[PDB]
């Protein structure tokens, strides 16, 4: 057993202590007798014997002597398995550089020595010298030279200085430096130069030096002098059938190293010239680099078939490395697969399994059972009995599979309902039989799909397959709490045909005694299923304490509903079957049956519904013919009446009355209108066109047309497809996105042209090609979500906070899109909310809001509840059960030990394949309410407001907000506040291409703040004669003029600036360029007059950008702190802006380009967070200025905006889990005796539990800021290197973990999957807990 | 205006600069550059527009 995993650098002595001897030559094996040659790469004296308990010569054998070492051949007598464990080594004749610690950016050598990469890569190729010692001279350490300057220094200084070349120089540099002294001298000499640009690199270098000092490594071990050699059985040399051999590539890469090292050991004995020894050292360096990482430092060495050779680093990383191919998913025994087909007679817990598959998968069970009954003497006779297929084998098989579940699985597995457990029923034939009700969780059908079969072997696996995964526990969805077993295609059609009615049906009028008599009359041929009758019916209810009370009546109904009522269980009202049922009504039936009665009645009721639907669909006789597609008789005239209009709109273009663009854009809509007319004529001629007469004469009723019947019931189809069957097809797009002019005026019942067919193929291929190239983006997103969320598990029962989040309905974009009931069902209340009076307590203030509480909330009217959330949980390393709420697939409080992260990721990722990739009116009557407002009366008897960010709400009968808008700034409110206005009434009027900005108070306007020669012209409208000093563009700019940006201001009878009530305010605002102002000089105005005006992607990409926390390319600018705004020093790179607190310091001022139109004038007072411009907001700013709840709310609303637009239902805590995982890091601002640095990035939980102990015994803690990382940057920044290494970028993760000296504690799920242990979630949660208790014991 | 960002003044400097581009890491001579440029697009045995 073990508890952790470590990683570090390896010294030469460590590499020599792993090995069993030195490899000295490239010999692999002998060419006549294929035996391993001595001292080569497959040597049997170093690496172990090639047969069990035999030496190589043949002298020793037979397991008598087990530890002897033969004296002839040196092989020891032992088992050959040891050729997978023993290593060797190679002693290099000159040191070489490890390529990982040199060329993985940032380089660790260049960061440790503070040298550029160019200088090092020049000293390493014998191309320049480097000074190691200065002696007493002008030259200093790490100075770079050339040959001539080296000769000059030699003949001038002589012996005192020291200069070298190659990896020996760099090893001497790394070996001589002192780390503690250097880091401490980086400490006190940073505070002066703690400027940011130097701050980042200085603190990075400081933490690197400190890591080397504390970890125990030495900086010179990054230069190799001894090399290890992998065991032979992991790089084998193997014969094929035919005498041919096959080999690994590491052999090819090791031979080059060995026989370039031997040549250098020769040249160093012949005492050759240095121009040749240098070439050898370069070649040795290149060979070792290609053995470690092939294509990194140059061209890739290729083999004799012109493909690059694979290296030690390509066997670990990538989609086909060890991690993703052999450790996170494997191939398994006891498994099979086959084609699936439907069996409609099965129960919900049953599957049909062929006899031959089951005989193969269950062989050891059958052998043991056979030799227990004495039917066979030994296992080898049992084998032949089974192989002959005697008759008793088939009777042993039937009692082996009795009460043995079997797991079925279909790929791709998008969520956990892709694997389910069944009980097998032996069949003849070769295809597997599946129940018709589970094909919706699998996404399966019978056009050729195939499924896989797995057999659990042990007692615990059988218990878990029965209790957790059996198909009769999985009726609800885990994403939303809805049922998943709804009936799809012919259950629906049969139940809909049996509960319809008809006029003048045979047997109309009778009075019957009960359902049994209606059935007996239908079977006999006396009544019809659609006949209107009167039946006596008994129904039950429960208002007693768990008991049922009955009551009988006479009801008016049809025969078919009375027949169906014999299926419904006791305790449901009759009004559920008295409709004409469709898919929605049947789903309602199943859901109310689950809410009232429970699980087992529901799983019996679903089966009964399926059987009776199939039976009556069969008896109906529904078919499809060519006459069932009815084309309306007035299409041929709508078409001509559109063609005449397009002709008479072409001839207004041939005579120069209309442009080409408007001509096209008018033909488009005069064809769209005719298409809509045709479609509505078609649909009205088809839907109720039945004239069936009655006892005296004719009347109308709904149609019994087959196509209409299967479209209207929800079995198969829609209106958009009958439109193409019987209407016209419509308008087609080019592959560009442009729409062709002439539409397709034909349908499929009539037949297309060559040309209409040709132009219809474009969109078909475009859709088919988008599907295949979207599935990859969806899968990659799911994998990143699973990797960020995998280690989050419900750990505790109650953390005890009072925090929460405020849930209200969403009413924007129109009507109420999401009620309050759908957003609090299941959550736990954060505070003791009270119905809209005072002290209307419903709560112990921890209350699981089940359906009765939601009904109580809706019989009153409350529209805001404070609830609990995971992004505010106080538990570290997990969540508590009360902050999470309800288990959405079980219907009760979540259990402690549940893996909520994998469920969140799977629920968000599964639907990703369906994503696409001038005046205010009021509807209904209610009060009008305003917020965030500041008002003034107008000159024309109306309301105006001087607020930019106000909100206008509509109040209902009881005071629940039904609609909410916001008005543009400067707009004039047509009517005031507190009004009960009816619908159809406008409340505010704004211009569609303009917005005015108004004065403050009635005063006297003066033309000031502008001269002639300024950004002002004297441009007067020559035809009408109205002009103020008008503000200009930058094309008419006079740079010397913009000394003061023009604005016409308001003065008193004093000639000076007007009072503003409440504060000594300047009454007038200076406006940016190109302003339209035509207000007269000398013609004064009143308060609120027109002084100036303002002239003027969804799908998977947006979801990925939200979770990755991208930054928009036009981000809005917000107020850093609260203060009075003004323009700053005006350094004209581009504009400068400052704000000033009324009490505090104001060193903060920064840059704004003049393209960015400002909406805050020099007299404004802003609070923290409000906008200074418009544009999409950036989430890091929302987290810095406003808190955590603001960025949570923004992210969840912007994500749900995309899913709701398509009809996809996902609960909202599944996004809160991801948002919690993106917020795990904190950054330190002021340490204060906290053992942390001053701008280091730490885990948030470490800071929290450090400050909770410092503050415990009376000390000052640390101060910090929160951070927001994307999902792939937060997956890689976790504190376990095995999860990060197995996710992505294995090279960077492993080099950084190696030089840092990290360790791993195996706390997530993936760490325990890699080493084959029980995960800490589920039925394995208790086990780990007990182990953790022993961690406190020792 | 293109002519005013060139560091070249005549045929030899241009050939030397092309040589420095195609084969970095050695100084050329008056014949190596001319032969390299005459091999690229103007010799029927290393170029063929079909």
């Amino acid at each position: 057993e073990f508890d952790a995993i470590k990683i570090a650098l390896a010294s030469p002595d460590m590499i020599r202590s792993w090995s069993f001897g030195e490899v000295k030559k490239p010999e692999t094996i002998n060419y006549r007798t294929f035996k391993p040659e001595r001292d080569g790469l497959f040597c049997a004296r170093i690496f172990g014997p090639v047969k069990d308990y035999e030496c190589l010569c043949g002298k020793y054998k037979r397991l008598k002597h087990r530890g002897v070492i033969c004296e002839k051949c040196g092989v020891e007598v032992t088992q050959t398995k040891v050729r997978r464990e023993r290593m060797g080594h190679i002693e290099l004749a000159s040191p070489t550089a490890h390529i990982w610690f040199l060329k993985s950016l940032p380089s660790r050598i260049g960061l440790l020595l503070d040298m550029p990469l160019r200088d090092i890569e020049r000293v390493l190729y014998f191309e320049s010298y480097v000074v190691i010692e200065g002696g007493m001279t002008n030259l200093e350490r790490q100075q770079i030279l050339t040959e001539e300057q080296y000769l000059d220094a030699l003949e001038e200084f002589g012996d005192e200085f020291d200069a070298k070349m190659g990896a020996e120089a760099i090893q001497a540099l790394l070996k001589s430096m002192d780390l503690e002294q250097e880091c401490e001298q980086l400490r006190e000499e940073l505070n002066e130069t703690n400027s940011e640009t130097k701050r980042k690199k200085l603190t990075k270098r400081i933490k690197l030096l400190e890591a080397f000092v504390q970890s125990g490594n030495k900086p010179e071990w990054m230069i190799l002098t001894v090399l290890p050699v992998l065991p032979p059985d992991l790089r084998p040399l193997v014969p094929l059938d035919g005498g041919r051999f096959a080999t690994s590539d590491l052999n090819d890469l090791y031979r080059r190293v060995i026989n370039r090292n031997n040549r250098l050991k020769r040249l160093l004995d012949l005492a050759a010239p240095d121009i040749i020894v240098r070439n050898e050292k370069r070649m040795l360096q290149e060979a070792v680099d290609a053995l470690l990482d092939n294509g990194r430092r140059g061209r890739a060495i290729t083999g004799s078939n012109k493909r690059p050779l694979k290296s030690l680093a390509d066997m670990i990383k990538g989609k086909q490395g060890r991690f993703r191919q052999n450790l996170l998913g494997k191939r398994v025994d006891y498994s099979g697969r086959s084609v699936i087909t439907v069996g409609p007679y099965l129960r919900l817990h049953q599957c049909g399994l062929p006899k031959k598959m089951a005989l193969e998968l269950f062989k050891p069970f059958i052998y043991g059972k056979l030799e227990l009954r004495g039917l066979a003497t030994t296992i080898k006779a049992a084998k032949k009995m089974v192989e002959r297929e005697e008759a008793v084998v088939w009777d042993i098989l039937d009692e082996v599979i009795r009460e043995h579940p079997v797991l079925l699985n279909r790929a791709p597995t998008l969520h956990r309902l892709g694997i389910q457990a069944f009980e097998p029923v032996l069949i003849e034939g070769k295809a597997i039989q599946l129940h018709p009700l589970v094909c919706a969780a699998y996404n399966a059908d019978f056009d050729g799909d195939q499924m896989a079969v797995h057999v659990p072997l042990t007692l615990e696996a059988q218990l878990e397959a029965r209790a957790l995964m059996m198909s009769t526990n999985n009726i609800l969805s885990p994403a939303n709490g809805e049922p998943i077993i709804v009936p799809s295609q012919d259950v629906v059609l049969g139940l809909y045909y049996m509960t319809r009615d008809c006029v003048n049906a045979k047997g109309e009028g009778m009075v019957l005694t009960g359902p049994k008599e209606a059935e007996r009359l239908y079977r006999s041929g006396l009544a019809s299923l659609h006949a209107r009758v009167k039946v006596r019916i008994t129904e039950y209810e429960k208002d007693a304490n768990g008991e049922l009370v009955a009551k009988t009546s006479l009801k008016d109904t049809t025969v078919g509903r009375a027949i169906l009522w014999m299926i419904v269980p006791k305790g449901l009202p009759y009004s559920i079957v008295n409709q004409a049922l469709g898919k929605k009504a049947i789903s309602k039936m199943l859901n109310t049956c689950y809410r009232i009665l429970g699980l087992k009645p529901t799983v019996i009721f679903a089966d009964q519904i399926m059987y009776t639907g199939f039976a009556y669909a069969a008896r109906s006789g529904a078919s499809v013919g060519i006459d069932d597609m009815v084309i309306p008789e007035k299409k041929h005239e709508i078409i001509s009446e559109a063609e005449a209009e397009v002709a008479e709109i072409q001839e207004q273009f041939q005579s120069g009355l209309v442009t080409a663009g408007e001509r096209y854009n008018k033909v488009i809509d005069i064809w769209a209108a005719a298409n809509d007319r045709v479609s509505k004529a078609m649909m009205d001629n088809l839907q109720t066109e039945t004239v069936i007469n009655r006892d005296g004469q004719e009347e109308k009723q709904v149609s019994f047309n087959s196509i209409y019947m299967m479209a209207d019931s929800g079995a198969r189809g829609s209106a958009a497809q009958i439109r193409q069957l019987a209407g016209m097809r419509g308008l087609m797009a080019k592959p560009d996105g442009s729409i062709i002019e002439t539409p397709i005026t034909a349908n499929f019942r009539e037949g297309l042209n060559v040309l209409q067919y040709f132009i219809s193929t474009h969109g078909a291929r475009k859709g088919l090609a988008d599907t295949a190239l979207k599935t990859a983006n969806s899968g990659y997103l799911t994998r990143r979500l699973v990797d960020v969320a995998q280690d989050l598990v419900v750990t505790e029962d109650d953390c005890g906070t009072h925090e929460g989040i405020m849930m209200t309905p969403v009413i924007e974009g129109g009507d109420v899109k999401e009620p309050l009931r759908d957003r609090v069902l299941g959550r736990v209340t954060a505070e003791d909310v009270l119905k809209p009076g005072t002290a209307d307590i419903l709560v112990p203030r921890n209350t699981l809001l089940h359906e009765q509480w939601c009904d109580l909330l809706e019989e009153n009217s409350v529209d805001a509840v404070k609830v609990r959330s995971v992004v505010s949980c106080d538990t570290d390393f997990g969540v508590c059960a009360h902050c999470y709420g309800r288990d959405l697939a079980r219907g009760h409080i979540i259990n402690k030990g549940e893996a909520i992260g994998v469920i969140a990721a799977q629920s968000i990722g599964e639907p990703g394949t369906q994503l696409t990739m001038s005046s205010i009116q009021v509807k209904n009557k209610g009060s009008i309410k305003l917020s965030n407002v500041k008002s003034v009366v107008n000159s024309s008897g109306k309301l105006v407001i001087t607020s930019r960010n106000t909100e206008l709400k509509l109040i209902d009968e009881f005071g629940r907000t039904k609609e909410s808008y916001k008005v543009p700034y400067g707009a004039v409110l047509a009517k005031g506040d507190g009004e009960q206005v009816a619908g159809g009434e406008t409340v505010a009027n704004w211009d569609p291409h303009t917005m005015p900005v108004i004065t403050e108070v009635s005063g006297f306007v003066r033309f000031t703040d502008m001269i002639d020669g300024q950004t002002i012209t004297r441009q007067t409208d020559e035809l009408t004669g109205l002009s103020s000093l008008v503000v200009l563009d930058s094309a008419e700019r006079t740079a010397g003029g913009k000394d003061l940006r023009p604005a016409l201001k308001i003065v008193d009878a004093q000639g000076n600036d007007v009072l503003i009530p409440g504060t000594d305010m300047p009454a007038q605002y200076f406006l940016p360029g190109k302003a339209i102002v035509q207000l007269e000089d000398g013609v004064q105005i009143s308060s609120g007059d027109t002084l100036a005006r303002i002239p003027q992607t969804g799908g998977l990409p947006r979801v990925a950008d939200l979770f990755e926390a991208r930054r928009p390319k036009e981000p809005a600018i917000l107020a850093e702190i609260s203060g009075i705004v003004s323009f700053g020093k005006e350094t004209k790179g581009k504009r400068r802006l400052v704000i000033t607190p009324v009490d505090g310091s104001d060193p903060y001022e920064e840059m704004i380009p003049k393209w960015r139109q400002l909406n805050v004038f020099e007299g404004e007072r802003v609070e923290r967070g409000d906008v200074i411009s418009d544009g999409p907001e950036a989430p890091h700013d929302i987290l810095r200025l406003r808190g955590v709840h603001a960025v949570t709310r923004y992210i969840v609303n912007e994500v749900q905006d995309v899913y709701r637009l398509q009809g996809v239902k996902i609960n909202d805590k599944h996004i809160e889990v991801i948002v919690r995982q993106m917020l795990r890091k904190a950054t330190i601002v002021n340490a204060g005796s906290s053992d942390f640095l001053e701008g280091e990035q730490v885990e948030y939980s470490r800071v929290k539990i450090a400050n909770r102990e410092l503050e415990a015994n009376g000390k000052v803690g640390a101060t910090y800021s929160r951070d927001l990382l994307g999902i792939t940057k937060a997956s890689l920044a976790t504190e376990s290197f095995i999860s990060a290494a197995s996710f992505q970028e294995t090279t960077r993760v492993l080099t950084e973990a190696a030089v840092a000296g990290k360790r791993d504690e195996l706390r997530g799920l993936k760490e325990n999957v890699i080493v084959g242990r029980l995960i800490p979630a589920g039925t394995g949660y208790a086990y780990h807990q007990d182990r953790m208790r022993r961690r406190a014991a020792g | 205006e293109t002519l005013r960002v060139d560091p070249t003044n005549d045929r030899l400097s241009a050939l030397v600069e092309i040589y420095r581009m195609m084969r970095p890491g050695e100084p050329p001579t008056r014949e190596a550059a001319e032969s390299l440029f005459e091999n690229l697009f103007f010799s029927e045995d290393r170029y063929d527009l079909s």
Binding site: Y125, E127, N279, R282, M283, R297 | R23, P24, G25
Partner: peptide
């Protein structure tokens, strides 16, 4: 030196 090839580094 704007090159990393050892055959050119030799022939130079």
């Amino acid at each position: 030196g704007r090159t990393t090839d050892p055959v050119r580094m030799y022939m130079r």
